Symmetry: D2
Subunit: 208 residues, 4 copies
């Protein structure tokens, strides 16, 4: 079984993106008898599409789990829906901000995630990791690769399971926000990584 | 040097109070050449006073650091001010809810904490633990023992440093709140404990 | 031109639902040369479908604008997407709580709103009403009638514009939450009503 | 009876401060047989002290009610405690940021407000204005003039009642925050003004 786990580079503002570390730390491990690959996507619409599609073609994973930073979220959120729209608030890392374009013209308005989101959520709860299901992943790069991946699954037949997991800030990112008079929630890195490993394990146990 | 660290039992609602574990885990350790004592206070106004004063008389600590659960707070907060008032929203664990009584009649309206709160905060930041200074500790038991302790310091001469540290929920407490449609912030236990150890260490380095 | 505006009864918990008053106050008025009808839907899955479809068949509105209470939201939110799923957290007013059922089996996963959401939003801003575009309407009755309505638009050809507007609590609903130690955001009723009238007016100015 | 009501100019950032309008609108009115004066204080430590003391000496009010903007608060908050400390996060309007200075050296650590805060709060609730008692007013200018005023009351004998009321943003201030991806709570101006008039009326009904 191959599993692709992606993460992103530092989105605008942040100096660190914990999903870049989760991708690198899971690269090359084996969970059960499944090889796990970990790749870090650019936060550039276009280039991220190019890279995501080469990686999908090249590895042909059975399960792809895309992970991103959700600033200000307080628990792990498992994404339910990806939607066919880009309405970027911030610019991407090249400086382009896209207001209301579709991702794939004429492709469906939305795709539901194919990961077993409620079993992933229940198992995370059993391990004491607070987690919930979110119904919107945003309309910037996190939703763009979540849509592109489930579109690829519908079109080409693989990956067989695709989905997105958003993670809080890790504590070390909070301490310079304190300075600007704000203290957003955080989760420690080790719980974040453990969470996307539990996700890979219950996706594998479902996927035959 | 003796250091008293207190924590509380489960306040109404909660099944677990992480400050009870912080008190037990620090009891009997030695940081440098300072003995640390750890005691767990009842969440009953009156009985908590009785126990706090016996413990203070019996150990005569140089530094007392009182620690409590601040549900919904997202980082470590170091308390600046204790005030002479009780205006309990919840009842204490015996069932008495006190609306607008002073703690010590005719004693000052407020005491500033004597811990070096800004150095504690800066060092926590250096260790990547998000922390800030809070200006109100509530007016239920957390503020009651914070006031009683700094009053004892002013009256009897010891402890020489007194202060209060409030800690977030720990992740395992968040997962049944998710059920009632809510996900409050959390901090992992090990960061909480490390944080009150760093507090003890920079209070000791100041206190001669 | 006929405009249907709906609102709901008190959802579970609340004693008042301001969208019930907005529906009654707009019933029978004329904006320009457009007749406005206002109806109040039950908060019961099934019955709400039945009533919505009779009302749509009977009035055959050119524009339908469905309005609901979004507890805890701080500004007017104009909904972008309705999705084909029900995952009720609370039970509906008859006591049935539905976990993961589609609304219309085999109908699309999502429908984008057909109201001119960015022009409605810009005009609200010009009148000083804080408003933003939300990308998830929930998966309980607010999203159920938003989906059913845009499905009817796609299937039967009318209404020609359909959409959903969520409104904050009104101040009089906040004052007993204060009691349970919480103060959620609110918006005054008159601004809420003015806001769905401005929505009707820029939908009418677009719709030929 | 004379009543002084103050408000402030635009603090750093904001282009508008609603408490400046509340001060101007109440200036010169009479509530019962009480003349009301309304003055707008500079947001400059030092100059605000100078102006506050001249105004207090010149009008010799029986009741002073100081009002300020509390960004992000969702209801009216009636301040319980003023504390003798300045620890400015933002600079004041001249550019000085003060970290840990007392307001009046050797004067008490805190003063409780002398307004009948719980009767003001109960009456606001009766008029459906959401309101609560806050236990910290900050440690920048809002707390500085609240401390200076209750100090003057204790020292010189007048004003006989002194207190501070913080108000939410008004809706027109929220709409450019929406742009920076945020929508803080708001309250409409007319409810804010009505709220400090109700405060003046129950303070007058108490004050003999």
């Amino acid at each position: 079984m191959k599993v692709l786990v992606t993460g992103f580079e530092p989105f605008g503002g942040e100096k660190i993106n914990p999903t870049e570390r989760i991708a690198k730390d899971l690269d090359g491990i084996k969970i059960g008898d499944a090889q796990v690959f970990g790749r870090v996507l650019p936060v550039v619409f276009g280039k991220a599409k190019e890279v995501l599609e080469k990686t999908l073609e090249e590895i042909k994973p059975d399960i792809a789990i895309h992970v991103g930073l959700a600033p200000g979220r307080s628990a792990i959120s498992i994404e339910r829906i990806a939607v066919n729209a880009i309405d970027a608030r911030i610019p991407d890392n090249e400086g382009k901000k896209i207001e209301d374009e579709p991702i794939v013209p004429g492709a469906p308005t939305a795709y539901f995630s194919t990961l077993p989101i409620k079993k992933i959520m229940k198992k995370l709860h059993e391990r004491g990791i607070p987690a919930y299901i979110s119904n919107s992943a945003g309309l910037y790069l996190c939703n763009y690769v979540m849509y592109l991946s489930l579109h690829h699954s519908a079109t080409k037949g693989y990956p067989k399971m695709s989905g997105f997991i958003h993670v809080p800030y890790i504590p070390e990112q909070i301490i310079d926000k304190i300075g600007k008079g704000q203290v957003p929630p955080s989760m420690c890195y080790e719980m974040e990584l453990e969470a996307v490993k539990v996700a890979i394990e219950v996706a594998l146990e479902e996927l035959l």
